[PDB]
Amino acid sequence: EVSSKIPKPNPATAMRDRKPLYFLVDDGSNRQQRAATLLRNVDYVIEAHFELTDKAGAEDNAGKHLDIFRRRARAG
RNA sequence: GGAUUGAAACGCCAUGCUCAGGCUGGCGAGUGCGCGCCACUCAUCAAG
Numbered sequence: 001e002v003s004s005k006i007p008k009p010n011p012a013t014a015m016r017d018r019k020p021l022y023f024l025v026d027d028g029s030n031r032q033q034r035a036a037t038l039l040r041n042v043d044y045v046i047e048a049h050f051e052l053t054d055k056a057g058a059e060d061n062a063g064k065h066l067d068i069f070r071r072r073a074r075a076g
Numbered sequence: 077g078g079a080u081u082g083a084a085a086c087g088c089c090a091u092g093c094u095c096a097g098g099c100u101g102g103c104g105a106g107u108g109c110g111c112g113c114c115a116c117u118c119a120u121c122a123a124g
Contacts, residue, residue, distance in 0.1 A: 031085095
């Protein structure tokens with residue numbers, strides 16, 4: 001894996017000169033080996049329900065989103 | 077359409093099993109051992 005996030009660039013400064021921007025993965029300390037102890041052959045059933053937020057409009061109702069989600073899940 | 081301690085994340089670059097070394101030197105299948113002792117093709121039937 002990689003050691004650090006890529007830096008935030010300066011767009012205008014980037015092409016004041018013709019130069020590359022990159023992160024070299026295998027350049028010394030940039031390479032970080034990370035192990036993972038992870039699960040196998042999992043299977044879950046999730047029980048959940050909706051709740052309207054302060055951003056909800058008048059036309060927004062929990063039942064409509066519930067049926068939309070059910071349609072999407074049934075159709076894959 | 078804001079957030080699944082998430083979002084991004086090569087084990088990777090390369091390295092003759094090689095150089096070589098008789099399975100050889102030599103050793104009779106051999107000495108010997110009757111297929112042999114006997115046994116009618118024979119008793120008949122013109123040529124037309």
